[PDB]
Structure 1
Amino acid sequence: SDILGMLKSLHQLQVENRRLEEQIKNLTAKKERLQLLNAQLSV
């Protein structure tokens, strides 16, 4: 079987997984920034 081709695809998944955890991190920071700024502007 095409184990090279399979390792390739598995690697593509691994990359994508790390790309997503990085997206989660930015969105989370975006959210928290907005939470703080909203509170700061309410007083």
Structure 2
Amino acid sequence: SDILGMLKSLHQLQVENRRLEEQIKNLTAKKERLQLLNAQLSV
């Protein structure tokens, strides 16, 4: 009741938190594929 404003703030941060962890996973997956291609062109 007195905390509705901060509860809604936390809610948006919780949604953004899950987007950022998902984005990181997609970026480390990409980085791994780019790392394998870099190795194949290198060695």
In the alignment of these two chains, the number of paired residues is: 43
Q: Deviations over 1:1-43 (max 9, x none)?
A: 7422211110101111111101110110111000001112335
Say whether 1:17 aligns with 2:17: yes
In the aligned structure 2, how far is the partner of 1:30 from the partner of 1:3? 41
Give the % identical residues. 100
TM-score by length of 2: 0.77
Which ranges in structure 1 are unaligned for 5 or more consecutive residues?
A: none
